[PDB]
């Protein structure tokens, strides 16, 4: 059985039943059954959101290289007002999140379509709706679940790297990759900063502190700039 | 019985001569704990091999490049072509990643003996690893382990201890005279009564700090000598 | 500790602490409200 | 058997190693009585947690002050916050005393009567205020991750880590107060001054700690 540390003993609460189980829990956060049940859904939702976000950022830079993703919320103008879009998103997200939360706390209780009584999701597990949500499932379910959780973890780390690279270099993912490929020995984080007992140098925050959006002055500070190496 | 580290001294109970190069020397009793003894043996082997490599590197470097000081060879401007004036960040990144991988593998081997012998990518590529700190196989392609491994291990630990003492000697000689081991030996051979530890001591030739490209690295001697 | 608290509960120690508290309260009142003659 | 504060001396009879961070340190026998010891355990836990929060906040603000972020020192942050923002100091004091009074009064009456706050008289909540042990209030509110209701050995290890970190944070807060009273600068400023010259920039050369120096 593959593990995050070959030759180590996995935790007792991690028996390898859940997909993506590699015996990684040094803090013992998943020891409780209810906590593990909640964290499983949290990881699945985080994985899917990060996967969609990373794919969207890459496609955004490929299709629109002149638009920075970090500035995408500012330099995008639509006939629909920002407050109207926020209201639409709030209502739709509230509806779907309440339905998902109710399915989590009460399994097999919101599988029925409230509009049409002839549509109902078949019995499933928490975090894996299926039915109308899965019109095509090519391959084994367990193998695909492992692939999904692994791709989701990679995408989560990728989004964190996207944010950090955008705050340190001020460029997109493809732009940062090209900049690093041009001079690999002088573009890493080690080449940009270093800390010693006599001096502590950190890279400057390329993101401006304030952003003017229709006369509102939205503050945009780099994530934990003081703790930057 | 084996010869101890001193005439008339009594070896400790835990030092029965099982390990190579055992002289019953433990004035601090640090080897009383078996787990601590195994960890200290691994640490001694690592120090021995690294010190042997350092001593050989300093000697070969002084022979091939006598115009380059080994103490200041770490500066980017003293690096050979085409690594001269290279970015130290990328170099540190390369070393950190590679050394971190190999040291984590070695550490896991120490925690769980015989559990990381197999290659994680190409299955079937394993090392025999008869004892801790002695992997063998790909690490010994010439096959010198199929014989008296005890005397060879004794030779290795003794040469490593001698190299540890020698490397510290090189460091103090460079910090007190400002020259390499061969240069210090030649200087002492020129006038033994004029160039020795009686007059070279008390002076620290190492500067206060050095500006490596952009950041400054503080430096100091092992003893409070005159800067 | 029980015996020490019992000793502190004796009449002279209790009287000393109580009178020190009462005197301190009166002194602080006269300090923050100097020369009070009438209500 | 267990390590004590002063090696060779037997630990006191009222300290048997059951509590977290037990090293038999009680030369004045302050916690000799069982009820007094229980009260002191809760006091030490509260002190350690408050000191941990204070030390972390002081270190973070000092880090932001050392780099060009505009953060103020810990001994001037209160004045800077009250003057920069239109915040009335007595109003903030009253609000904090109200919230702290409610939380501390509930904790106090739970100490006097264990499990009494679980009756449901506070908005119907019952299991969230039952309390696991003295000074360790488990539940879904104080422990949402459930690290205290799973892997008992890990829970005991975390208890030892918490009490030791709390004691270290208390010593750190005392050090912050003494360093500001002596040198007059921030804690990271003292750390940088010491790293610049450790042989001549310390408490033995500040001119305040040792008056005969
Ligand atoms: C998961 C969602 C999400 C994320 C990660 C971001 C991330 C970002 N947005 Mg959006 N946004 C998001 C959703 C949305 N943004 C906007 C509208 C805007 C605008 C108008 C702007 C941004 C800007 C920014 C950037 C600066 C963030 C900051 O410091 O905010 C600080 C403020 C908060 C964190 C919000 C307050 C607290 C929150 C919990 C409520 C940043 C890269 C700014 C930019 O371009 O900067 C360069 C900018 O001007 N976003 C809308 C409405 C359509 C969103 C709807 O979901
Ligand atoms: C986390 C998901 C996510 C989010 C928040 C965004 C957000 C944004 N994208 Mg983007 N995108 C995404 C995923 C996402 N995208 C993915 C996965 C792709 C690959 C197909 C793309 C490809 C893409 C392109 C090519 C472009 C953007 C652009 C933009 C920006 C303005 C466009 C807009 O929203 O107007 C409204 C968008 C529409 C009206 C299109 C129709 C909306 C469809 C029909 C909704 C489909 C819903 C879907 C089935 C449900 C999946 C939900 C899932 C994410 C959880 C905006 C900040 C534009 C930009 O760069 O700004 C200048 C731009 O050109 N995106
Ligand atoms: C782990 C021990 C060790 C370490 C840390 C070093 C470190 C170093 N050696 Mg060295 N060396 C060693 C062992 C070691 N050596 C041994 C055992 C030998 C004998 C074969 C040599 C023979 C040697 C020579 C002949 C030279 C160096 C040089 C150098 C310096 C430049 C690095 C380099 O060559 O570019 C990178 C190397 C590769 C990419 C491969 C560097 C500080 C060079 C120097 O003097 O710098 C000016 C040089 O000319 N070494
Ligand atoms: C063992 C007692 C002893 C002690 C306590 C000291 C102490 C001192 N010596 Mg000294 N020294 C000693 C023995 C000792 N020495 C002997 C036996 C010799 C003859 C080899 C010397 C030769 C010597 C020289 C040439 C100088 C000093 C100097 C100094 C002073 C500066 C510290 C330093 O790093 O210099 C040197 C450190 C050492 C010599 C290490 C001592 C090794 C001992 C023997 C280990 C036991 C310092 C107060 C320096 C000074 O006078 O300051 C201006 C200086 O230049 N010493
Ligand atoms: C029984 C005799 C007597 C009486 C009636 C008084 C009465 C008074 N004395 Mg006096 N005094 C006396 C004997 C007496 N003294 C003696 C024997 C001495 C020598 C030790 C002194 C020496 C003395 C000094 C030096 C001073 C007074 C002062 C005062 C006035 C202070 C009022 C006060 O304390 O504020 C108010 C007290 C309270 C509000 C406490 C209330 C208790 C609780 C907290 C509230 C409960 C209430 C419901 C007061 C009118 C002071 C003064 O200013 O004179 C005008 C003052 O300076 N007295
Ligand atoms: C009990 C310990 C403690 C105390 C007394 C303080 C006190 C203070 N902190 Mg601090 N802090 C602490 C712990 C503490 N902190 C810890 C553990 C951390 C994480 C390491 C931080 C990180 C931190 C940062 C980053 C900042 C402060 C700041 C401040 C000052 C402004 C008040 C404030 O927080 O704004 C307002 C209070 C709130 C926003 C709380 C919201 C109330 C909620 C919504 C009610 C529900 C104030 C003097 C700020 C400062 O430096 O002043 C300029 C600042 O930016 N703190
Ligand atoms: C909207 C006002 C505001 C402003 C102008 C700042 C500004 C700053 N904060 Mg900060 N912070 C804020 C709100 C704010 N904060 C709030 C409400 C919290 C509680 C969650 C924090 C908690 C916080 C921490 C823990 C730290 C900072 C730090 C910093 C400094 C480094 C840049 C940074 O933001 O890293 C980003 C850090 C974040 C936690 C991002 C959260 C801030 C966004 C805008 C959300 C706030 C919206 C809120 C709901 C209204 C910087 C000067 C760092 C510092 O002190 O330097 C040493 C630091 O470590 N802040
Ligand atoms: C359900 C269903 C069913 C039916 O039947 C059908 C259908 C409809 C099809 C469906 C759907 C699906 C979906 C949605 C999918 C998606 C996915 C994704 C997005 C993934 C990603 C995923 C993603 C991922 C992993 C990502 C990754 C990334 C990465 C690593 C990155 C990296 C980087 C960085 C950091 C930075 C730099 O500068 C660059 C680089 C270097 C490059
Ligand atoms: C046993 C015991 C126990 C009992 O109980 C007690 C007592 C007595 C305490 C004891 C003893 C101890 C001792 C003696 C110790 C010592 C050690 C050492 C010397 C080490 C070194 C060790 C050493 C070492 C590792 C070293 C290494 C080195 C190196 C790598 C080098 C490198 C280099 C080179 C090449 C050159 C170039 O240019 C640079 C560099 C980079 C610089
Ligand atoms: C045990 C015993 C018994 C026997 O028998 C005898 C003897 C020996 C006496 C003993 C001992 C004792 C001791 C040591 C004690 C100590 C304690 C402490 C230090 C505490 C602190 C403690 C401390 C603490 C809490 C602290 C806390 C802190 C805090 C909150 C802070 C805050 C803040 C901040 C953030 C910043 C801003 O800007 C300001 C402020 C606002 C300021
Ligand atoms: C617009 C009205 C919104 C609500 C206004 C404030 C009401 C807040 C009251 C919270 C409910 C407190 C009691 C909660 C549960 C009760 O204990 C149950 N009946 C159990 O006995
Ligand atoms: C600035 C001061 C504001 C004072 C705010 C007081 C808020 C109520 C405090 C009441 C505490 C009562 C504690 C119970 C006493 C007891 O248990 O004996």
TrEMBL record, chain A:
<feature type="binding site">
    <location>
        <position position="23"/>
    </location>
    <ligand>
        <name>chlorophyll a 5</name>
    </ligand>
</feature>
<comment type="function">
    <text>The light-harvesting complex (LHC) functions as a light receptor, it captures and delivers excitation energy to photosystems with which it is closely associated.</text>
</comment>
<dbReference type="GO" id="GO:0009768">
    <property type="term" value="P:photosynthesis, light harvesting in photosystem I"/>
</dbReference>
<feature type="binding site">
    <location>
        <position position="225"/>
    </location>
    <ligand>
        <name>chlorophyll a 30</name>
    </ligand>
</feature>
<feature type="binding site">
    <location>
        <position position="46"/>
    </location>
    <ligand>
        <name>chlorophyll a 9</name>
    </ligand>
</feature>
<dbReference type="GO" id="GO:0009523">
    <property type="term" value="C:photosystem II"/>
</dbReference>
<feature type="binding site">
    <location>
        <position position="24"/>
    </location>
    <ligand>
        <name>chlorophyll b 2</name>
    </ligand>
</feature>
<feature type="binding site">
    <location>
        <position position="4"/>
    </location>
    <ligand>
        <name>chlorophyll b 2</name>
    </ligand>
</feature>
<feature type="binding site" description="axial binding residue">
    <location>
        <position position="121"/>
    </location>
    <ligand>
        <name>chlorophyll b 1</name>
    </ligand>
</feature>
<feature type="binding site">
    <location>
        <position position="99"/>
    </location>
    <ligand>
        <name>chlorophyll a 13</name>
    </ligand>
</feature>
<keyword id="KW-0604">Photosystem II</keyword>
<feature type="binding site">
    <location>
        <position position="46"/>
    </location>
    <ligand>
        <name>chlorophyll a 8</name>
    </ligand>
</feature>
<feature type="binding site">
    <location>
        <position position="195"/>
    </location>
    <ligand>
        <name>chlorophyll a 26</name>
    </ligand>
</feature>
<feature type="binding site">
    <location>
        <position position="46"/>
    </location>
    <ligand>
        <name>chlorophyll a 1</name>
    </ligand>
</feature>
<feature type="binding site">
    <location>
        <position position="188"/>
    </location>
    <ligand>
        <name>chlorophyll a 24</name>
    </ligand>
</feature>
Automatic annotation (TrEMBL), chain B:
<feature type="binding site">
    <location>
        <position position="78"/>
    </location>
    <ligand>
        <name>all-trans-violaxanthin 2</name>
    </ligand>
</feature>
<feature type="binding site">
    <location>
        <position position="47"/>
    </location>
    <ligand>
        <name>chlorophyll a 1</name>
    </ligand>
</feature>
<feature type="binding site">
    <location>
        <position position="196"/>
    </location>
    <ligand>
        <name>chlorophyll a 30</name>
    </ligand>
</feature>
<feature type="binding site">
    <location>
        <position position="196"/>
    </location>
    <ligand>
        <name>chlorophyll a 28</name>
    </ligand>
</feature>
<feature type="binding site">
    <location>
        <position position="173"/>
    </location>
    <ligand>
        <name>chlorophyll a 28</name>
    </ligand>
</feature>
<feature type="binding site">
    <location>
        <position position="158"/>
    </location>
    <ligand>
        <name>chlorophyll a 25</name>
    </ligand>
</feature>
<feature type="binding site">
    <location>
        <position position="119"/>
    </location>
    <ligand>
        <name>chlorophyll b 4</name>
    </ligand>
</feature>
<dbReference type="Pfam" id="PF00504">
    <property type="entry name" value="Chloroa_b-bind"/>
</dbReference>
<feature type="binding site">
    <location>
        <position position="119"/>
    </location>
    <ligand>
        <name>chlorophyll a 21</name>
    </ligand>
</feature>
<feature type="binding site">
    <location>
        <position position="26"/>
    </location>
    <ligand>
        <name>all-trans-violaxanthin 1</name>
    </ligand>
</feature>
<feature type="binding site">
    <location>
        <position position="156"/>
    </location>
    <ligand>
        <name>chlorophyll a 11</name>
    </ligand>
</feature>
<feature type="binding site">
    <location>
        <position position="24"/>
    </location>
    <ligand>
        <name>chlorophyll a 3</name>
    </ligand>
</feature>
<feature type="binding site">
    <location>
        <position position="200"/>
    </location>
    <ligand>
        <name>chlorophyll a 28</name>
    </ligand>
</feature>
<feature type="binding site">
    <location>
        <position position="44"/>
    </location>
    <ligand>
        <name>chlorophyll a 3</name>
    </ligand>
</feature>
<feature type="binding site">
    <location>
        <position position="159"/>
    </location>
    <ligand>
        <name>chlorophyll a 1</name>
    </ligand>
</feature>
Automatic annotation (TrEMBL), chain D:
<feature type="binding site">
    <location>
        <position position="162"/>
    </location>
    <ligand>
        <name>chlorophyll a 11</name>
    </ligand>
</feature>
<feature type="binding site">
    <location>
        <position position="47"/>
    </location>
    <ligand>
        <name>chlorophyll a 5</name>
    </ligand>
</feature>
<dbReference type="InterPro" id="IPR022796">
    <property type="entry name" value="Chloroa_b-bind"/>
</dbReference>
<feature type="binding site">
    <location>
        <position position="183"/>
    </location>
    <ligand>
        <name>chlorophyll a 16</name>
    </ligand>
</feature>
<feature type="binding site">
    <location>
        <position position="44"/>
    </location>
    <ligand>
        <name>chlorophyll a 3</name>
    </ligand>
</feature>
<feature type="binding site">
    <location>
        <position position="24"/>
    </location>
    <ligand>
        <name>chlorophyll a 2</name>
    </ligand>
</feature>
<feature type="binding site">
    <location>
        <position position="47"/>
    </location>
    <ligand>
        <name>chlorophyll a 4</name>
    </ligand>
</feature>
<feature type="binding site">
    <location>
        <position position="202"/>
    </location>
    <ligand>
        <name>chlorophyll a 18</name>
    </ligand>
</feature>
<feature type="binding site">
    <location>
        <position position="162"/>
    </location>
    <ligand>
        <name>chlorophyll a 9</name>
    </ligand>
</feature>
<keyword id="KW-0934">Plastid</keyword>
<feature type="binding site">
    <location>
        <position position="165"/>
    </location>
    <ligand>
        <name>chlorophyll a 15</name>
    </ligand>
</feature>
<keyword id="KW-0602">Photosynthesis</keyword>
<feature type="binding site">
    <location>
        <position position="179"/>
    </location>
    <ligand>
        <name>chlorophyll a 1</name>
    </ligand>
</feature>
<feature type="binding site">
    <location>
        <position position="167"/>
    </location>
    <ligand>
        <name>chlorophyll a 1</name>
    </ligand>
</feature>
<keyword id="KW-0793">Thylakoid</keyword>
